[PDB]
Design a protein around this ligand. Sequence first.
Ligand code: NK5
Ligand code: K
Ligand code: K
Ligand code: ZN
Length: 400
Amino acid sequence: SVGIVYGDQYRQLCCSSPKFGDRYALVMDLINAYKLIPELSRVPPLQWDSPSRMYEAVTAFHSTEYVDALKKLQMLHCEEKELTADDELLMDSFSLNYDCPGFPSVFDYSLAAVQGSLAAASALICRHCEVVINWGGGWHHAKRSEASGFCYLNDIVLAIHRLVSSQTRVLYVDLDLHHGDGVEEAFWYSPRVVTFSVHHASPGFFPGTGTWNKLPIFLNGAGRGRFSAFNLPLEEGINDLDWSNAIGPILDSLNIVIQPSYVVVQCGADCLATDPHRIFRLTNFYPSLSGYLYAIKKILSWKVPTLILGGGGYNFPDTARLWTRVTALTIEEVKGKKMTISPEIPEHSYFSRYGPDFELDIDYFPDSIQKHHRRILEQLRNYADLNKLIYDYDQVYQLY
Ligand SMILES: O=C(NO)c1cn(-c2ccccc2)nn1
Ligand SMILES: [K+]
Ligand SMILES: [K+]
Ligand SMILES: [Zn+2]
């Protein structure tokens, strides 16, 4: 079946942050308004038997002292008093400041995404679901002991760790506008988790990595993980077709050579033309075919158990518009069952958020890459050689 993570408490927690507001409620209620929920298997978020078990799960990646600080941050923000100078310094040492501030539910909010993505990994491992979707997860920037880009706990890394520890190889595909630095870093030394991020990069643009680092070079992993971290940085303004042609052959080549046991896709919605970032010009169109839907369709065609996660996306109605279509496409491709979606937003609780036109399409009128393809193809060959993987070089070369 196709699973999707939700629950009443889960929804409350995912809607408790100052930055993402009620975005999760709009996403799930649009999916419900299009009558998709009966097609989906609800996957409940993971809960634990004790504080000690919870800490064991989260500190599989994060440090105990970072988790301690994040829990303390929530406790401090549940009291009226200002933080002490010592406590401010403590939070600063974990980057729990500026773009990752405290708020009264910051620990429960961050933990909830972990609970959802770990439950999603488990549903794939026991084969209850072929694909599981978690639109409350996808927080790819968080590091072992550092919050980053309103990511506090890295649910993706923890989900992948549960998958790889279930010859298991995971392919991670990061479609967010931003480089997936936290996930890349976590698996920098691991050949069994191959990471691939497509993103914008330019001087001063967050987080700064995923690009050229004497002709400067692309770093791509270290130790036994050399050549196992893949990146495609793209110039601003790219449209659905050029983004699809840029990543399409890379995705197919990675699947052929790696033969992954699981695929984990981060589907951050900030590449939409209507995102306030206004960097890329992707759409959610489904006849100009949405780059997101193109990539998800291709990944799902491999018939590999797959985890689909959220991420960025600061236009909340248009994020719901895109992820609703991703969800319908996943049902269609997995179950072989057509999903008809009206071009008009159905009546429901959040209908007013989709004005003034109330349509499902977002409101938008639509050399360098060749060199990246040759570089990435050589890195894939180097990865295959280093890791004793066999494949016909010319079936792969033909893809490009
Ligand atoms: O959407 C994102 N990444 O997925 C993001 C964007 N943020 C950002 C932080 C500082 C400056 C500019 C942008 N932090 N995270
Ligand atoms: K990305
Ligand atoms: K890796
Ligand atoms: Zn982003």
